[PDB]
Design a protein around this ligand. Structure first.
Ligand SMILES: OC[C@H]1O[C@H](O)[C@H](O)[C@@H](O)[C@@H]1O
Length: 612
């Protein structure tokens, strides 16, 4: 409890030329950091010494932050990630361009699309053999050799930065691969690193925990080398870190800052809802898990304020707001959170031709805290998790119930008339590319030009929705070219049995070349999306600090989304021509060229109209 001594510990390693700005930020945020750490570790006898030692290390890393990034830290404004020009892209570096140097040479492509936020999937050193597509991390401080070197990472972020692109990287902080140095040291008998994990000799403690835990068989894995049961929420080769140990917090905070110093500007906080373990509970979305994130945010506010934290928490709407900070800490936790509820409702709506479901989600979308926004999306590297919509599926006063079962069966083409070509993964989730799910694949396979045109309208409709949202709209690699499924995985050696590869294709650069050709399918999709991106960028009304709402319409097939007080986006989720009367939405304005009026607004099947 000696603030000046802690401040001195942090200040020591800083250089005089760059100590004032840093110390100024420490002075305004350090208290929140110390309060969070006290709540978590304050009772431990080793707390004070650990704290002063770690702060010194933090100071040393702060000092090492390249000048260009320190400059960014000082010039970037809070809320920068929510400006209308922000557009995201998510891809595997290997699938995209093979290696990190390859990705850097494709930046022009990302620049032309209008990308300003690039999420590269797990590219840090991963477990030998199976590693869940990189999510079993074995070194948080080093790039996977098959992808390149840390030098290539620095050259990539420097290049990205020039093009106005912020690299988002996964920070898998809940668990590490079981061949991570810490885990190997544990396996070797080091009690210091064994304690970086949750380990038990008998199933005595594990069963008590098992009493209230939900399983993502069981939550523990026997390990001969440590001769103990290790907590393994996900794959058996992924050991849950012990965040109740101050050392784990310290070292993980340092790893995060080292990544920030390599150019990482955004952190996708993986499985962040499982961070805190307490018997008698489901060990999910725990109070302390949020305190951990508040502490990591305070660390970034001090050392690398240009960076943002994004929660990866695929949970129902009601459990997302706390990720932006609750009560006293609102605005002091994560900057972004995935709006998975919206993503699943978009597809549910499309399959059911029901815009009322989207009115329901937006109408109930909790208002964003200042300087916080949503990561809106259509697809990603995982299966579509329909269960986050359990609550909305029950219906309410305005929206009758809908069937998650039927929605999943429709996209799995397990029902007669479906234009979808996804596959059930495990209500089981759905695998498949956006174009495969919206009808593009089926139409191409039937060589049915009319159906193709309509399928194209459906894909665009879903993306138009994400693009009108407050935050970062994230395009999943290849959707901009309407790439379809990749059944090749069923032929690949050690990849069959992992159905998600169906929607993890290697980037098709020939298709990409066709983007110029407006008569081609890829070129048609690319142009429609670019048009929305272009219009979005010019609408200050779409900035994340402007309101988001939805006007209740009595025609269930329509969805009216509003931003601020000047923008309205109209959507027809059915295959019928219909119209919306100006009365119902109180308008008479300009029709945006996503491509005026005092007459009703006619919407073609699956059409979208942006009005100012
Ligand atoms: O635990 C492993 C899982 O972590 C996250 O949920 C990733 O999004 C998913 O792709 C991965 O399989």
């Amino acid at each position: 409890i000696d603030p000046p001594a802690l401040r001195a510990a942090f200040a020591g390693p800083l250089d005089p030329q760059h100590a004032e700005v840093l110390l100024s930020r420490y002075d305004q945020h350090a208290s929140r950091l110390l309060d969070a750490l006290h709540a978590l570790y304050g009772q431990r006898a080793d707390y004070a010494s650990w704290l002063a030692q770690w702060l010194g290390e933090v100071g040393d890393i702060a000092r090492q932050r390249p000048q260009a990034l320190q400059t960014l830290d000082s010039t970037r404004h809070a809320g920068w990630f929510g400006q209308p020009h922000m557009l995201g892209y998510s891809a595997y570096a290997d699938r995209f361009a093979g290696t990190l140097q390859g990705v850097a040479e494709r930046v022009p492509y990302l620049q032309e699309l209008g990308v300003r936020y690039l999420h590269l999937l797990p590219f840090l050193r991963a477990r030998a053999g199976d590693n869940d597509g990189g999510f079993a991390v074995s070194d948080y401080g080093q790039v996977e050799p098959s992808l390149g070197s840390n030098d290539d990472l620095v050259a990539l972020t420097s290049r990205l930065r020039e093009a106005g692109i912020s690299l988002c990287a996964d920070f898998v902080l809940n668990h590490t691969a079981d061949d991570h140095a810490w885990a190997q040291a544990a396996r070797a008998g080091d009690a210091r690193y064994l304690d970086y994990y949750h380990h038990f000799a008998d199933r005595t403690v594990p069963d008590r925990y098992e009493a209230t835990l939900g399983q993502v068989p069981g939550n523990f894995t026997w390990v001969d080398d440590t001769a103990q049961w290790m907590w393994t929420t996900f794959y058996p080769y992924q050991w849950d870190l012990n965040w109740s140990n101050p050392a784990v917090f310290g070292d993980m905070a340092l790893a995060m800052l080292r990544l920030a110093n390599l150019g990482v500007e955004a952190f996708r906080l993986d499985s962040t809802a499982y961070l805190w373990k307490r018997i008698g509970t489901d060990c999910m979305n725990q109070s302390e898990a949020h305190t951990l994130l508040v502490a990591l945010r305070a660390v970034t506010d001090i050392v690398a304020p240009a960076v943002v934290m994004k929660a990866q928490a695929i949970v129902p709407m009601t459990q997302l707001p706390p990720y932006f900070g609750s009560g006293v800490d609102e605005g002091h936790e994560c900057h972004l959170a995935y709006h998975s509820t919206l993503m699943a409702a978009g597809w549910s709506a499309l399959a059911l031709q029901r815009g009322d479901i989207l009115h329901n989600v937006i109408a109930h979308s909790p208002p964003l805290p200042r300087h916080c926004a949503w990561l809106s999306y259509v697809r990603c590297h995982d299966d579509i998790g329909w269960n986050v919509l359990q609550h909305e599926a029950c219906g309410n006063a305005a929206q009758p119930p809908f069937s998650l079962r039927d929605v999943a069966r429709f996209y799995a083409n397990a029902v007669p008339g479906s234009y979808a070509r996804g596959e059930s993964f495990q209500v089981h989730g759905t695998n498949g590319m956006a174009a495969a799910l919206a009808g593009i694949q089926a139409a191409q396979e039937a060589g049915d030009a009319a159906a193709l045109a309509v399928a194209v309208d459906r894909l665009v409709l879903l993306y138009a929705i994400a693009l009108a949202m407050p935050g970062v709209p994230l395009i999943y690699m290849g959707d901009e070219l309407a790439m379809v499924n990749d059944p090749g995985y069923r032929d690949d050696p050690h990849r069959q049995h992992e159905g998600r590869w169906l929607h993890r294709p290697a980037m098709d650069w020939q298709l990409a070349a066709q983007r110029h050709d407006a008569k081609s399918l890829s070129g048609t999709v690319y142009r429609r999306l670019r048009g929305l991106i272009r219009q979005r960028a010019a609408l200050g009304a779409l900035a994340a600090d402007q309101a988001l709402a939805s006007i209740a319409l009595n025609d269930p097939r329509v969805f009216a989304l509003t931003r601020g007080d000047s923008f309205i986006a109209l959507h027809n989720f059915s295959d019928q021509l219909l119209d919306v009367e100006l009365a119902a939405i109180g308008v008479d304005g300009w029709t945006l060229l996503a491509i005026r009026g005092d007459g009703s607004i006619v919407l073609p099947p699956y059409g979208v109209r942006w009005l100012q």
